[PDB]
Amino acid sequence: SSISLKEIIPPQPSTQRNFTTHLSYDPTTNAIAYPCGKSAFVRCLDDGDSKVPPVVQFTGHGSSVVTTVKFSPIKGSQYLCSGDESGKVIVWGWTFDKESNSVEVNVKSEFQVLAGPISDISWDFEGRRLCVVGEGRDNFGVFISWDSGNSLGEVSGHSQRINACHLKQSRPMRSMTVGDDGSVVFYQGPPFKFSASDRTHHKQGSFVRDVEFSPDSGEFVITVGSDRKISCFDGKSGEFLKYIEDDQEPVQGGIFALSWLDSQKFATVGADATIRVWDVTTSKCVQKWTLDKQQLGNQQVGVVATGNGRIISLSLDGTLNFYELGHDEVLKTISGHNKGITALTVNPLISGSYDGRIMEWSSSSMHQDHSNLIVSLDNSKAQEYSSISWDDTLKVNGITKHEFGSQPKVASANNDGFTAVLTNDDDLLILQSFTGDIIKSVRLNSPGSAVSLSQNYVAVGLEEGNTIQVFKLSDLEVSFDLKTPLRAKPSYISISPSETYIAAGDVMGKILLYDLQSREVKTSRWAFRTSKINAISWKPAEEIEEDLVATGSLDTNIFIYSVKRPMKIIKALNAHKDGVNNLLWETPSTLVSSGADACIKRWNVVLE
């Protein structure tokens, strides 16, 4: 009996308005690396079948949000380096398929580089040296060895935050750090030492967002920023050569990033939702692609050349846009979440995060209608879905059908087109999911922290004494109390499909199984989790008797308990970093989970 990972739908790259998201690409594995929340991801761009893991997730930064992730330049080393807001940089490696037939991530080294957040990281061409930058205390960056962390020079010439850096990928070695107040600094080394600064070519007060030496001999170094200027310097002497400008193509928005496709051409991306490919020698824009400027999410905040004329651009809305020099049309777009997933539905698969974003995976439709945490999703009506959010609205297919007088804390929908909601004013509301009309309501005796709606009942977890009250869906004046209460505030409740049982967990990790009809406890032997229970879902028959119940908690784990054998547990550890939020049976033999890491995972459940 087991639960094995079947598929991982990674999140999109994290993004911030007015900030660049530095991406990374590896030719050998044809993968891109990027941060999202407290994790660093490596996504393979391949299709069909390959030897490369579809996804590699690194959670070693713990409680610190990851800022950047960079592949080592050494082919096949399978090493990477990432930094976080706490100012810590980590060198780690992965391995896939062996005795385990799974991915293994190992920290090779870690150093506390800066006080404040790290903004960018760069490897030397040997993959043994690192230029780490950001904004610490009286120190905005360093040059260190990848293994011991010893200093290999100094970052200087900056009185403000450094936004990007890059090391010439060849001898003689040179470096460039770029930052706020239009500051740019050239270095020679190792040991990397200040060579010259420049604050005349980029407007003062401007944000110089990115820098990169041309490939091969690195004869050129280019810097770009919010002042929409493209500065070209000599890759060895650091002298200013000229601005890259084409009178037939004015840059209309602040630039966020660049990336060379080869030794003569490079792409720039900015707030004007335009991707441009420039030729350094002629200074002409040989290619460009645009998106509707009227949509804030279309701003391009990151970009990376992926070999042979291919380019991947990152939109502010987290979407990855695929282009190819010589083809005037975008090849494809990949969208998704980059914020914790708080709501899930199955058949069809629909997800919602804490920023209000909803994903319709059947049609790859991404929505940004809601503006806050998605409380619940209902897909009981053919081709439609109803969502509730902390923005105080209920929307049907992205259209507001009800405005909440009180913020909905939690909610649960059955299969008949109804949804039970618990508000901040302690009211239990029953709404017609696809019309938005409140059909009936009752004021709870105390605040409610969890609700489960079955065909005929409404189970509510009361914060007063952590008790569970069960109402008749047909008459909210009629209810009964489960004899035994939980030991802490109810966190999640789930009435069995036949309504024979009611599983209920609390914020401590305790889960109790009740016999709905006798309102008595049937078993209290289900292992304590020492962590908040976030999801409970009953397994459907392919024997028809209810038994196995999947559960996820803040302890990142997935425990499938058994009514019949309370001591029998099939589990999958480390399902989601910072906790499994939703869990459902897409199939009698397959589970789908989602977590605070903004990932959605499918699992095969084998009873053997």
Stretch that binds a second copy, among 183-191, 275-283, 398-406, 556-564 (CB under 8 A): 398-406
Q: Do 92 and 80 form a contact (C-beta atoms < 8 A)?
A: yes
Cα gap 224→220, rounded to integer Å: 13
Give the count of beta carbons closer than 10 Å to the beta carbon of residue 531.
17
Residue 608 binds which one of Zn ion, a second copy, none, with CB within 5 to 8 A depending on kind?
none
Residue 333 within binding range of a second copy, rule CB under 8 A: no
Residue 271 within binding range of a second copy, rule CB under 8 A: no
Q: Do 132 and 110 form a contact (C-beta atoms < 8 A)?
A: no
DSSP character string of 314-372? EETTS-EEEEETT--S--EEE----S-EEEEETTTTEEEETTS-EEETTTTEEE----S
Count the site residues for a second copy by CB under 8 A. Answer: 28
Structure tokens at 539: 């397994």
Residue 295 binds which one of a second copy, Zn ion, none, with CB within 5 to 8 A depending on kind?
a second copy
- φ/ψ of 354, rounded to 5, equals -80, 5
- φ/ψ of 296, rounded to 5, equals -45, -40
Stretch that binds a second copy, among 221-229, 395-403, 481-489, 592-600 (CB under 8 A): 395-403
CB of 400: closest distance to Zn ion in angstroms? 11
Residue 160 binds which one of a second copy, Zn ion, none, with CB within 5 to 8 A depending on kind?
none
Structure tokens at 398: 């992205």
> Binding string to a second copy for residues 334 to 363, with x set by CB under 8 A, is what?
-----------------------------x
Give the strand pairing for 475-481 and 490-495.
Answer: unpaired
- Comparing CB distances to Zn ion, the nearer of 393 and 556 is 393
- Comparing CB distances to a second copy, the nearer of 369 and 463 is 369
- Comparing CB distances to a second copy, the nearer of 263 and 368 is 368
Stretch that binds a second copy, among 394-402, 444-452, 512-520, 579-587 (CB under 8 A): 394-402
Per residue, the 3-state secondary structure of 484-512, as one string, reads: CCCCCCEEEEEECCCCCEEEEEECCCCEE
Residue 253 within binding range of a second copy, rule CB under 8 A: no
Residue 586 binds which one of Zn ion, a second copy, none, with CB within 5 to 8 A depending on kind?
none
CB of 335: closest distance to Zn ion in angstroms? 12
Pick from 400, 441, 484, 587 the residue near a second copy by CB under 8 A: 400
Cα gap 457→388, rounded to integer Å: 20
- φ/ψ of 48, rounded to 5, equals 90, -100
Cα gap 410→11, rounded to integer Å: 24
- Comparing CB distances to a second copy, the nearer of 104 and 384 is 384
Pick from 107, 115, 296, 399 the residue near a second copy by CB under 8 A: 399
Cα–Cα distances (Å) from 72 to 33, 123, 124, 230, in that order, read: 11, 6, 9, 27
Structure tokens at 132: 């780490």
Provide the residue count of the chain.
608
- Comparing CB distances to a second copy, the nearer of 204 and 362 is 362
Q: Do 214 and 280 form a contact (C-beta atoms < 8 A)?
A: yes
Cα gap 187→106, rounded to integer Å: 32
Residue 248 within binding range of a second copy, rule CB under 8 A: no
Residue 324 binds which one of a second copy, Zn ion, none, with CB within 5 to 8 A depending on kind?
a second copy
Residue 382 within binding range of a second copy, rule CB under 8 A: yes
Residue with tokens 């580089």: 113
Residue 252 within binding range of a second copy, rule CB under 8 A: no
CB of 477: closest distance to a second copy in angstroms? 35
Residue 365 within binding range of a second copy, rule CB under 8 A: yes
- Comparing CB distances to a second copy, the nearer of 171 and 327 is 327
- Comparing CB distances to a second copy, the nearer of 43 and 202 is 43
CB of 297: closest distance to Zn ion in angstroms? 12
Residue 382 binds which one of a second copy, Zn ion, none, with CB within 5 to 8 A depending on kind?
a second copy
Residue 290 within binding range of a second copy, rule CB under 8 A: yes
CB of 60: closest distance to a second copy in angstroms? 35
Closest CA to 366 of 345, 350, 346, 348: 350
Residues that bind Zn ion (CB under 5 A): 329, 367, 369, 398
Range 2-61, binding a second copy (CB under 8 A): 47-48
- Comparing CB distances to Zn ion, the nearer of 245 and 369 is 369
- φ/ψ of 537, rounded to 5, equals -145, 125
Structure tokens at 526: 């289900």
CB of 57: closest distance to a second copy in angstroms? 26
- Give the side-chain half-sphere CA count within 13 A for 594: 25
Closest CA to 296 of 262, 312, 272: 272
Pick from 23, 45, 261, 291 the residue near a second copy by CB under 8 A: 291
DSSP character string of 169-226? SSSSEEEEEEETTTEEEEEEETTBEEEEEE-SSS-TT--EEEEEE-STT--EEEEEET
Structure tokens at 377: 């999703």
User: Shortest Cβ contact with Zn ion: which residue?
Assistant: 367
Stretch that binds a second copy, among 32-40, 293-301, 419-427, 488-496 (CB under 8 A): 293-301
- Give the side-chain half-sphere CA count within 13 A for 86: 15
Cα gap 258→591, rounded to integer Å: 41
DSSP character string of 278-296? EETTTTEEEEEEE--TTSG
Residue 292 within binding range of a second copy, rule CB under 8 A: yes
Residue 329 within binding range of a second copy, rule CB under 8 A: yes
- Comparing CB distances to Zn ion, the nearer of 215 and 398 is 398
CB of 326: closest distance to a second copy in angstroms? 4
Residue 332 within binding range of a second copy, rule CB under 8 A: yes
Stretch that binds a second copy, among 69-77, 155-163, 191-199, 287-295 (CB under 8 A): 287-295
Binding site for a second copy (CB under 8 A): 47-48, 290-295, 309, 324-329, 331-332, 363, 365, 367-369, 382-383, 397-400
